[PDB]
Amino acid sequence: RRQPVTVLLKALGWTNEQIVERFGFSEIMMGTLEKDTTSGTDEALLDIYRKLRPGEPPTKESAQTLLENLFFK
Amino acid sequence: LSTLEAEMAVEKKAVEDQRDADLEARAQKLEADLAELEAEGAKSDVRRKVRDSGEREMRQLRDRAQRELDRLDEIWNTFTKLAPKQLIVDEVLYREL
Amino acid sequence: AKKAPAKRAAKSAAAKAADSVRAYLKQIGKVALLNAEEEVEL
């Protein structure tokens, strides 16, 4: 729990303007990114990494492949 | 407690002296290098990216010295307030204690 | 990534935190692999 849907949309590497571009008519789509404090796409992967794999200090090689391997792979 | 605090102060100071010594050397190096950059005709944005890179390498040196100053303060605070039933999860800290 | 590498220091937040084998792997990971010269030394 405690996971905003916006923090992951940035985890793919999409910049916020894309959120404002794709979200559009969605008001809570902007307010969720407006409330979310995650700055950067790699920092959001880290907030996702410690919630998904608690106990293991991550690596930029492991932080990126985690999301890719989980679903897309 | 007296001799311990006294040995901790010197230790924390020795780290401080070093941070200063190291930080002034990296600054003079950047002064020397921005000097050659003006000696030759050098694009303005190139002279600033040398300072930007040089400024950032300094923040690293200070941050690292700060980390050790905090690690040392954590050691001393922990040991002075130390009481039975307290829990120590660091184990690198615990080893230092 | 100069301010990101300081965020990669969240690896420190991980070393402070369910499975028993995960627990044992965390600790054996803290040591460092020797090369041929050190093995002889030891």
Closest CA to A33 of C13, A22, A60, A42: A22
Resolution to one decimal, Å: 2.8
CB atoms under 10 Å from CB of C4, counted, come to: 15
Please name the helix (run of DSSP H) or strand (run of DSSP E) that holds residue B43, with its range, or none. none
Best mutation site among B91, B93, B94 for testing chain C: the one with the most C CBs within 10 Å?
B91
Approach to solving: X-ray
Yes or no, beta carbons of B63 and C6 under 8 Å apart: yes
Task: Tell me which long-range contacts B29-34 makes (C-beta under 8 A, separation of at least 24).
Answer: B29/B54, B30/B54, B30/B55
| Axis crossing angle, helix A27-35 with helix A16-23, rounded to the nearest 10 | 160
User: Are C3 and A46 spatial neighbours (Cβ–Cβ below 8 Å)?
Assistant: no
- Answer whether C33 touches B (CB < 8 Å): no
Contact criterion met (CB below 8 Å) for C26 and A55: yes
Burial of residue A22 (CB within 10 Å: 0-12, 13-18, 19+) is exposed
C-alpha to C-alpha distance for B43 and B40, rounded to whole angstroms: 10
CB-CB under 8 Å, A60 with C13: no
Q: Tell me the nearest-neighbour CA distance from C11 into chain B, angstroms.
A: 13
Residues in chain C: 42
> Could you say which DSSP state residue C8 is in?
G
Q: Where are the alpha helices (DSSP H) in chain B?
A: 2-39, 44-81, 92-96
**Cβ-based neighbour number of residue A49 at 10 Å:** 24
**What six digits make up the tokens of A4?**
């905003």
B87 contact C CB<8A: no
Asked if residue A43 lies in contact with residue A13, where contact means CB atoms within 8 angstroms, the answer is no
Distance of alpha carbon B75 from alpha carbon B69, whole angstroms: 10
CA nearest to A46, candidates C18, C12, C7: C7
Q: Which residues contact A9 (CB under 8 A, 6 or more apart)?
A: A19
Partner chains of C (3+ C-beta pairs under 8 Å): A, B
A56 and C14 in contact (C-beta within 8 Å)?
yes
